Enzyme design. Structure first.
Site, short mmCIF file in Angstrom:
data_model
loop_
_atom_site.label_atom_id
_atom_site.label_comp_id
_atom_site.label_asym_id
_atom_site.label_seq_id
_atom_site.Cartn_x
_atom_site.Cartn_y
_atom_site.Cartn_z
NE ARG A 1 33.28 45.56 -70.74
CZ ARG A 1 32.29 46.04 -71.50
NH1 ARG A 1 31.85 47.26 -71.37
NH2 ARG A 1 31.72 45.26 -72.40
CG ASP B 1 29.85 55.25 -69.74
OD1 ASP B 1 30.59 54.37 -69.38
OD2 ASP B 1 29.13 55.16 -70.70
NE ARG C 1 35.94 49.74 -73.38
CZ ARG C 1 35.19 48.93 -74.13
NH1 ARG C 1 35.58 48.63 -75.38
NH2 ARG C 1 34.09 48.38 -73.62
C1 LIG Z 1 28.35 45.48 -70.39
C2 LIG Z 1 27.76 46.51 -69.36
C3 LIG Z 1 26.36 46.89 -69.77
N1 LIG Z 1 27.68 45.73 -68.20
C4 LIG Z 1 28.07 46.29 -66.94
N2 LIG Z 1 27.78 45.62 -65.91
C5 LIG Z 1 28.17 46.17 -64.69
N3 LIG Z 1 27.89 45.56 -63.58
N4 LIG Z 1 28.86 47.32 -64.70
C6 LIG Z 1 29.24 48.01 -65.77
O1 LIG Z 1 29.93 49.09 -65.66
C7 LIG Z 1 28.79 47.46 -67.02
N5 LIG Z 1 29.09 48.16 -68.15
C8 LIG Z 1 28.54 47.69 -69.30
C9 LIG Z 1 28.87 48.50 -70.49
O2 LIG Z 1 28.63 48.05 -71.65
N6 LIG Z 1 29.56 49.51 -70.39
C10 LIG Z 1 29.81 50.47 -71.45
C11 LIG Z 1 29.51 51.86 -70.99
N7 LIG Z 1 29.68 52.99 -71.91
C12 LIG Z 1 31.02 53.25 -72.34
C13 LIG Z 1 31.19 54.47 -73.10
C14 LIG Z 1 30.25 54.56 -74.32
S1 LIG Z 1 30.95 53.59 -75.65
C15 LIG Z 1 29.84 53.81 -77.10
C16 LIG Z 1 29.48 55.19 -77.53
O3 LIG Z 1 28.50 55.77 -76.68
C17 LIG Z 1 28.47 57.10 -77.09
N8 LIG Z 1 27.89 57.89 -75.90
C18 LIG Z 1 26.66 58.50 -75.87
N9 LIG Z 1 26.41 59.09 -74.70
C19 LIG Z 1 27.58 58.87 -73.98
C20 LIG Z 1 27.91 59.34 -72.76
N10 LIG Z 1 27.04 60.07 -71.92
N11 LIG Z 1 29.11 58.94 -72.29
C21 LIG Z 1 30.01 58.33 -73.04
N12 LIG Z 1 29.75 57.85 -74.28
C22 LIG Z 1 28.51 58.22 -74.67
C23 LIG Z 1 29.88 57.58 -77.50
O4 LIG Z 1 29.87 58.25 -78.79
C24 LIG Z 1 30.61 56.23 -77.54
O5 LIG Z 1 31.38 56.04 -78.75
C25 LIG Z 1 28.90 54.02 -74.01
C26 LIG Z 1 28.86 52.77 -73.17
C27 LIG Z 1 27.38 52.41 -72.91
O6 LIG Z 1 26.79 52.94 -71.95
O7 LIG Z 1 26.82 51.63 -73.68
#
Ligand SMILES: CC1(C)Nc2nc(N)[nH]c(=O)c2N=C1C(=O)NCCN1CC[C@@H](SC[C@H]2O[C@@H](n3cnc4c(N)ncnc43)[C@H](O)[C@@H]2O)C[C@@H]1C(=O)O
Ligand SMILES: [Cl-]
Ligand SMILES: [Cl-]
Ligand SMILES: [Cl-]
Length: 422
Positions: free
Chosen positions: A98, A103, A88
């Site tokens: 990606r 998460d 990634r």
């Molecule tokens: C494009 C989209 C919306 N479209 C989708 N469409 C379908 N159908 N299916 C999908 O799966 C799908 N996925 C999508 C998507 O963008 N995915 C990214 C999911 N994750 C990845 C890890 C973190 S990366 C940024 C920072 O977040 C901070 N952070 C805060 N809290 C947490 C936590 N609890 N866990 C991990 N990181 C955390 C850290 O400090 C990290 O540096 C957060 C990010 C998110 O949620 O925005």
């Protein structure tokens, strides 16, 4: 130690591979135990309104439940390192495709609210692809900030999600796509039956599809290299046209014995191909160079080209005969730089074996796997020898016995089973 739900997503590359490699990375930590893996789920990409259409590719999502001595911020660091190792780009355009996302969806009843890390994940309750696998893993879980919420009802409100029949099990199913004249079904203005047949494989749970143009009939009309290539090429073009919308994008194996065909198909289509399944390992030296160059998986089949039925293999020296042969071909692949983990073996039940020989070899598959230190591909489907059936059994009977043996092989954790019907 503390229990966590980790959500895992992907929408580019070999999708089931990507998820599995994230899970293997977690499982390789001595301070993590994997408690349970959820089902695989399929959903359309959630994107901003102005996103390029090229970013609109179906996601594959799941979750795992773990116990670990890592504290939440330490777990986050591990997850980021796993994302990096898988490939990634942590600074790629938000919303763009990606290879992996990890998460922390929940940690029992923990509420942690920091700029770097919020638990439960802030968007858990708005994303069906995170809530569905989480609730499969933790049936009675309430969100600790919103304990009153019936999350089962919330999930129905969100909708927009398919629970696949593809799974994260140790045994993956390779569904057969036969492009020979046995499956010819063109009509006046359509050639789409193979399209419905592709959909049936996907819907029914095939994790891999094996595409071949040779007929299995005794004494079939042989086909030129050009004709074989063209049939594969056409199908692959069609597959590429549909990739982004499929509910599940299967790993693709190409079933051919001809070096030429492998070269031309890989040159044109390597980035969508996961494996080469070779029906007869002649010229293994030059095939090895091609598999090394493209980093693909390869299957060694025990097919010695025997045409005299009197010369078919007897059970008493069958293990030695199959091992000696596969061992020698393995060693050639290894000397050409192919990683051993990319090599599978197939006993080849329908090639040069008496019925009892086939049965005996299948009974000893795990010993053969250990002896060769290779993963196993079992092609039992519609083969009356290993099914223990009369050679003129009808298709309903062949498929019923096939499914029953499949369940048995899955319980034995055979690596790949090649089947006509899931
Ligand atoms: C494009 C989209 C919306 N479209 C989708 N469409 C379908 N159908 N299916 C999908 O799966 C799908 N996925 C999508 C998507 O963008 N995915 C990214 C999911 N994750 C990845 C890890 C973190 S990366 C940024 C920072 O977040 C901070 N952070 C805060 N809290 C947490 C936590 N609890 N866990 C991990 N990181 C955390 C850290 O400090 C990290 O540096 C957060 C990010 C998110 O949620 O925005
Ligand atoms: Cl609930
Ligand atoms: Cl699963
Ligand atoms: Cl599973």
């Amino acid at each position: 130690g503390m229990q966590y739900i980790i959500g895992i997503g992907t929408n580019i590359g070999f999708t089931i591979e990507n998820i599995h490699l994230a899970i293997t990375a977690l499982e390789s930590q001595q301070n993590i135990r994997i408690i349970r893996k959820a089902s695989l789920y399929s959903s359309k990409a959630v994107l901003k309104e102005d996103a390029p259409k090229e970013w609109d590719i179906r996601f594959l999502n799941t979750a795992v439940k773990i116990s670990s001595s890592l504290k939440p911020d330490e777990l986050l660091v591990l997850l980021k390192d796993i994302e990096l190792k898988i490939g990634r780009d942590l600074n790629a355009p938000a919303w763009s495709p990606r290879v992996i996302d990890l998460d922390i969806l929940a940690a029992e009843d923990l509420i942690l609210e920091t700029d770097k890390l919020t638990i439960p994940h802030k968007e858990l309750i708005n994303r069906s692809f995170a809530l569905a696998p989480l609730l499969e893993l933790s049936k009675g879980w309430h969100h600790p900030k919103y304990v009153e919420w019936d999350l089962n009802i919330r999930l129905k409100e969100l909708g927009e999600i398919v629970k696949l029949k593809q799974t994260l099990a140790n045994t993956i199913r390779m569904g057969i796509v036969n492009l020979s004249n046995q499956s010819f079904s063109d009509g006046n203005f359509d050639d789409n039956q193979r399209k419905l047949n592709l959909d049936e494989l996907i819907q029914s749970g095939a994790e891999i599809i094996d595409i071949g143009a040779e007929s299995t009939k005794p004494d079939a009309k042989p086909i030129s290299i050009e004709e074989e290539f063209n049939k594969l090429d056409e199908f692959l073009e069609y597959f590429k046209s549909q990739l982004a919308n499929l509910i599940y994008k299967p790993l693709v194996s190409i079933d051919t014995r001809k070096l030429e065909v492998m070269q031309k198909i890989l040159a044109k289509h390597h980035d969508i191909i996961w494996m080469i399944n070779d029906v007869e390992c002649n010229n293994i030296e030059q095939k090895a160079q091609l598999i090394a160059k493209y980093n693909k998986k390869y299957v060694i089949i025990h097919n010695l080209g025997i045409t005299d039925r009197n010369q078919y293999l007897d059970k008493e020296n069958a293990i030695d005969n199959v091992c000696d042969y596969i061992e020698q071909k393995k060693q050639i692949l290894l000397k050409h730089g192919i990683a051993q983990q990319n090599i599978y073996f197939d006993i080849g039940f329908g090639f040069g074996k008496k019925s009892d020989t086939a049965r005996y070899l299948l009974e000893n598959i795990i010993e053969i796997k250990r002896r060769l230190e290779l993963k196993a591909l079992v092609g039992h489907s519609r083969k009356p020898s290993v099914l223990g059936l009369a050679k003129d059994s009808n298709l309903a009977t062949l498929d019923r016995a096939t499914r029953e043996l499949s369940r048995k092989l899955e319980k034995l954790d055979i690596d790949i089973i090649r089947v006509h019907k899931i």
